């Protein structure tokens, strides 16, 4: 066993080792190991991505116009965001500017994704860590109706409805086929909702499972299908025709109407179901406002997103602010530059890759993806891992750092950055939220806080959806229909050698694609993805990433039942396929 100090933590791998493999209710494959002391407190945490596909290798030699379709398949959960980063990167490399409607439609695609993804995470992925589904069976339907009605104007709150939901659950479990509920953590002492709140939450789980399918109709209109809608270098392929012959072959008034109807329904669900549920989880679990802080009071990062001025990716254009905080100094939001070789770098000394020098970090324009499965001295063997060795290589995830600092990304990170840059909407929303919980602003810096910020962002994004739609309609009313710029579509028009960066804020955080084009083909294509940041392994200094930090110092009630580990991990919404690509 060893012990060392980093980022205010004491990393100590003495004591009992717990393994959680597989982590479920995430996308993709993750393993987590911890050590706990005699007081059942976590003293060491180990984040391991257990999958790899190699999109950065696959992309070599491809046509840059095709790249978006390949990288879109990095992930089906955050579907579309890699395509968006890709077209941005290729356009940045080649020197393409898209028309205003293409940019607006891209912003609609991303806001739609934020709504959908946040909603599904909240209910289907994280929800069962907070809601005890089996305890819903003990609730009183009337008291459930009263609770719901006290929290929201949402129509669907009758005692009869809650009784029907409850009976549906009762029927489901009656045959002993508990399905997704089998061998859960139900009854664990960390489940703190009253039975009525559990029945309300479970009903909402079902409503959200049904409703989420509607949100992505917006993707189907502009992008053909969801998952994995279509895009193009130069704008979007969804040509618009409102008032001319052949509008039946294009985005026309009836298609736009469909989009508007979804937007209103999406806002209504988020605002009257998800929001009050997030607040209710907060009210019954206030101690989790002090658990899982990790890096969120030290180092947080956002690239920024949603350029409102087409083709302008600066501060005056981005509706979701970018910036970096380090050393817990939230008075100094620092500017981020994705071309600067001293800013973003990835390390692989604790990852399954080769570098010429593994003690240094490589900026993505100098990135290397040369897989090397080398778990070294594990307890077990290289095809039968009992215990990873965190003193050596232990993940398929590379370790990004910003100016050498370990950062947290994602909804909490963005919320902190926007709050501290003085974004008025964000300040107001956060303040009102923490005031309703009677918690200080610091209470957001926590596992509970990550959940609250995710709900806040869903509401923000649903509002931005309407704003973008209104901008699109304003252009159409002015006769501005263009959706693609094609003067540089043909490879002969491109620079012989060029490179570009495409960045955005995906649901889970800061996303970047770095591309180099040479002789008409992809020469290099490196991705650094938000769960790569958060799920990062250690660096040459032993600095821990966001997940490992958030897990540190956590009390477990029952070591064999990793509910507290799942709560914290799930609060970051892990996307392991994204993390490894």
């Amino acid at each position: 066993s060893t012990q060392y100090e980093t980022q205010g933590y004491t990393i100590n791998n003495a004591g009992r080792r717990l393994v959680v493999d597989p982590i479920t209710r995430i996308e993709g494959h993750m393993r987590c190991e911890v050590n706990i002391n005699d007081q059942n407190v976590i003293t060491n945490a180990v984040s391991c991505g257990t999958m790899f596909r190699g999109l950065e290798i696959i992309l070599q030699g491809r046509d840059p116009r095709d790249a978006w379709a390949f990288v879109e398949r990095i992930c089906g959960v955050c579907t579309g965001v890699h395509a968006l980063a890709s077209v941005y990167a290729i356009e940045d490399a080649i020197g393409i500017k898209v028309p205003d409607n293409a940019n607006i439609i891209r912003n609609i695609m991303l806001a739609t994704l934020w709504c959908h993804d946040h909603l599904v995470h909240f209910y289907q992925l994280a929800g069962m860590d907070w809601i005890d589904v089996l305890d819903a069976l003990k609730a009183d339907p009337r008291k459930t109706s009263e609770l719901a009605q006290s929290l929201s104007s949402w129509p669907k709150s009758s005692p009869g409805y809650f009784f029907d939901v409850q009976n549906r659950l009762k029927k489901f479990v009656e045959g002993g086929q508990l399905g997704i509920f089998r061998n859960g953590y139900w009854g664990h002492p960390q489940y703190k909702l009253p039975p009525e709140a559990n029945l309300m939450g479970f009903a909402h789980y079902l409503e959200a499972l049904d409703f989420q399918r509607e949100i992505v109709k917006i993707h189907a209109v502009f992008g053909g299908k969801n998952p994995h809608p279509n895009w193009i270098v130069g704008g979007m392929p969804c040509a618009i025709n409102i008032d001319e012959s052949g509008a039946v072959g294009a985005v026309n008034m009836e298609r736009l109407n469909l989009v508007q109807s979804i937007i209103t329904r999406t806002a209504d669900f988020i605002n009257n179901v998800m929001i009050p549920d997030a607040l209710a989880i907060g009210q019954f679990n206030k101690p989790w406002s002090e658990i899982g802080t990790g890096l969120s009071d030290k180092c947080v990062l956002s690239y920024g997103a949603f350029p409102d001025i087409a083709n302008d990716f600066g501060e005056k254009s981005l509706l979701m602010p970018g910036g970096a905080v380090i050393n817990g100094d939230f008075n100094n939001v620092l500017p981020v530059d994705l071309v600067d070789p001293q800013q973003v770098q990835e390390f692989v000394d604790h990852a399954w890759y080769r570098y010429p020098n593994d003690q240094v970090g490589r900026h993505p324009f100098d990135g290397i993806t040369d897989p090397w499965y080398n778990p070294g001295d594990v307890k077990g063997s290289d095809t039968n891992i009992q215990q990873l060795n965190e003193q050596e290589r232990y993940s398929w995830i590379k370790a990004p750092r910003w100016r050498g600092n370990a950062m947290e990304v994602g909804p909490l990170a963005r919320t902190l950055i926007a709050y501290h840059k003085g974004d008025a909407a964000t300040v107001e929303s956060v303040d009102r939220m923490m005031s309703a919980l009677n918690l200080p602003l610091s209470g957001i810096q926590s596992t509970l806080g990550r959940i609250l910020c995710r709900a806040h962002e869903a509401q923000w994004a649903a509002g931005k959806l309407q704003y973008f739609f209104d901008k699109l309609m304003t252009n159409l009313k002015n006769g501005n229909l263009a959706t693609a710029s094609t003067e540089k579509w043909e490879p002969a028009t491109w620079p012989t050698e060029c490179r570009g960066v495409g960045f955005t804020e995906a649901p889970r955080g800061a996303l970047g694609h770095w591309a180099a084009i040479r002789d008409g083909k992809i020469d290099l294509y490196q991705c650094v993805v938000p769960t790569t940041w958060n799920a990062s392994p250690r660096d040459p200094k032993g600095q821990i990433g966001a997940y490992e930090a958030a897990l540190m110092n956590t009390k477990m009630a029952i070591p064999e039942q990793p509910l507290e580990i799942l709560r914290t991990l799930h609060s970051f919404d892990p996307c392991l396929a994204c993390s490894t690509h």
Binding site: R65, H219, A220, P227, A577
Partner: protein
């Protein structure tokens, strides 16, 4: 009792699970609560780690010979299978254990069916489709990246309602949805027949819904239901929204040249 289903995930992007939950009729809710017993699924199950391993073991033992196995994704043969690790071992060991007890296997998606993006050149991981590893069980291939949500649910409802596997073509794809090409039921076919093509994005042809063949559309060689059943409760499909078919339901579609070349 509801038919037991064990749903496992290899190397994948989770697009097929997402597609499934988009189903409009039946709702995925109703499929899970009333039509099948979804007894193991990494994406949605409460249990993790040792509790999830106990579910897996209990279900495949108690329902040995009686569960449907759904597979999303694929196994990598590279690095002794440790490009995809589950419970500290190669994913392929879990695939084989699950497959051994199954009554039938559904290979969801082009990943499980054929390889999909991870198997595209140069296939760093040696990702391999399910039927090249499991050779002694019925495998229904449901390709597409991902397959259509209501296709997925219709296949499930067919199996439950009619108590039989769908009839398949010689590649193991259900005849019901994969018997015809996209281009055999494409609403832009009149334009193809007339030589009326989009030649550059957002030209006048594109604004009238002309054929996307000269923009690289792979509809003529792609078998799926996108041009008839369509996507997301009938709202659209790739061609209807102005992009040529990528060929995503076909083996090897990533490596047939640019999406934008004919």
């Amino acid at each position: 009792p509801r038919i037991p289903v064990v749903w496992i995930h290899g190397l994948e992007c989770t697009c097929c699970t997402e597609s499934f939950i988009r189903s409009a009729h039946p709702l995925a809710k109703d499929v899970i609560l009333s039509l099948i017993s979804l007894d193991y699924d990494d994406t949605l199950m409460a249990a993790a780690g040792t509790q999830a391993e106990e579910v897996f073991e209990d279900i495949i033992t108690q329902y040995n010979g009686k569960y449907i196995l759904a597979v999303e994704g694929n196994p990598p043969l590279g690095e002794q299978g440790m490009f995809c690790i589950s419970s500290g071992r190669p994913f392929i060991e879990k695939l084989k254990r699950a497959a051994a007890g199954a009554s039938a296997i559904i290979a969801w998606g082009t990943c499980a069916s054929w390889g999909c993006v991870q198997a595209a050149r140069p296939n760093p991981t040696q990702a391999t489709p399910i039927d090249k590893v499991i050779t002694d069980k019925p495998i229904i291939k449901v390709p597409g990246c991902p397959p259509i949500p209501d296709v997925m649910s219709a296949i499930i409802t067919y199996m439950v309602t009619f108590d039989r596997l769908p009839d398949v073509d010689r590649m193991g794809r259900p005849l019901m949805f994969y018997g015809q090409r996209i281009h055999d039921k494409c609403y832009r076919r009149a334009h193809f027949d007339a030589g009326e093509f989009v030649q550059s994005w957002d030209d006048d042809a594109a604004r009238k819904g002309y054929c996307l063949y000269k923009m690289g559309c792979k509809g003529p060689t792609t078998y799926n239901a996108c041009s008839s059943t369509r996507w997301n409760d009938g709202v659209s499909f790739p061609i209807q929204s102005g992009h040529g078919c990528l060929g995503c339901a076909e083996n090897g579609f990533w490596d047939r040249g640019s999406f934008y070349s004919r």
